[PDB]
Symmetry: C2
Subunit: 287 residues, 2 copies
């Protein structure tokens, strides 16, 4: 038994200088990422009631906490992410499979959510393309099980992952945090040459997955010299997304009606061209 | 040497009962289909001068002819496609590798473009999903070369390719026409009950690839039940697009300047929500 019309939530994030109709935003590249692996998408608004969130939670099939630069502590983004985090834990312990995906800022957010602490250090990683230095524990993993061996071989030797983060969590900080060490299997590391950090991870016991890098960018973003656009990079964003959506398909939630569905989908919104100015070709702004 | 920022053309087609800002249209799933394979998109307006289809041909890196139900002889569509077809032939002859893709209507139109004759029959193929009855010659084929073997088997065995076409060419009419049979290599066939048709093909001496079915829909359209949506369906839409974009990676054309490139991209346009009603979640409408 499965759900082959999977619908996935994407978290909006506080506009730095809000104005009506600019309160939150989602980079269109996160939408393309999930659509391309066969999902439909719901933008999750920011300053909402516990209960609207739960409703929404009960309706969708997975969440993605996307990259960015807003507060991990005081932002709307961080509130909603927390609420989705615990709802997802509960539901999963109740046989109700619900996956969470954290990209960049979302990865960081998850280290905070599960550790109860802010463990970040500065890295020289604000715009660089990097292989993955895979761990022993990779042959175990879920995330990569279905990747062509040849793609795995490329991700290890070729600059295919986009890093655009000011912050990271080092190997030592991670390994030394008791809550993290037992919650997350670490699938990959990288280094800027000084600090060594966690680049990809996945919960031992939960469908929670996170990358410090931005998979979405390879296929869908074209604004910076350091975005990977080789044939293996494009295959990277596909297989990455394909796994998370293949995870959402195990979830069996669905909306109360279908008039509710149609009213909540990304189709309902129009992005703007923001590619001359920002790192994103296209962005959805919300009230 | 190759081009890692490929830009592909998709042709708009005539709107049934035109209005201003409604003279032609492109379903957004053709845009998603290319972008997800790591190409940027350029919508090619409908009733324009030759010199201009030529300034466009020279700038972009391939063309796709999207499906539809519009005249194959007197449409703004077919006049434009014909011009790109001849431009593309002449460039390949001259060492300028330039690929062309024909989907459904565009497949039907290619047959007319290369034989010079309208050779189509009615088939019962409006809204049905089918595997693909491959031919002997798929084994040495270009299009299917980089596909996983498991996927080739899933495709020969499962309702993976969606079909919403009123017409097809039978194999009989294909084999019988001398130009087609010497120009195009047949990769797959289907049948509807008493009619047996060509459903996938590529050219022997030019990078021209066509499908009678619509790969794009699997991942991006949810309006209709016959649209396949299994993990294998979803892999099929990406491998198809991936091949095409890899072909465009071999063309080295560029725009005379970045402003000129920026003005031409699908980013300048906002699609309308049309999924309540139409077969298409979102559709781009042009003046």
């Amino acid at each position: 038994k499965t759900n082959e019309r999977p619908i996935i939530g994407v978290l909006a994030q506080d506009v730095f200088d809000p104005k009506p109709d600019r309160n939150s935003y989602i980079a269109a590249s996160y939408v393309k990422f999930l659509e391309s692996a066969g999902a439909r998408v719901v933008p999750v608004m920011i300053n909402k009631s516990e209960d609207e969130y739960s409703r929404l939670f009960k309706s969708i099939n997975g969440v993605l906490f996307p990259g960015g630069g807003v507060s991990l502590e005081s932002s709307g983004y961080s509130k909603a992410a927390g609420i989705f985090y615990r709802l997802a834990l509960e539901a999963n312990s109740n046989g109700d499979y619900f996956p969470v995906w954290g990209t960049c800022l979302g990865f960081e957010l998850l280290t905070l959510l599960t550790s109860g602490e802010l463990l970040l250090s500065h890295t020289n990683t604000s715009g660089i393309a990097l292989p993955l230095d895979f761990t022993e524990d990779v042959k175990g993993s879920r995330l990569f099980k279905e990747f062509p061996e040849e793609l795995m071989k490329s991700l290890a030797t070729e600059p295919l992952t986009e890093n655009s983060h000011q912050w990271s969590i080092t190997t030592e900080n991670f390994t030394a945090n008791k809550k993290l060490k037992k919650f997350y299997r670490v699938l990959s590391t990288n280094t800027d040459g000084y600090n060594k950090f966690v680049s990809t991870m996945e919960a031992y016991d939960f469908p929670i997955y996170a990358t410090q890098w931005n998979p979405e960018k390879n296929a869908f973003e074209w604004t910076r010299p350091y975005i990977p656009h080789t044939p293996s990079a494009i295959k990277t964003t596909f297989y990455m997304a394909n796994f998370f959506v293949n995870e959402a398909r195990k979830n069996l939630h669905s909306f109360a009606s279908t008039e509710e569905e149609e009213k909540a989908l990304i189709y309902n919104y129009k992005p703007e061209y923001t590619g001359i100015q920002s790192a994103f070709e296209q962005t959805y702004f919300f009230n």
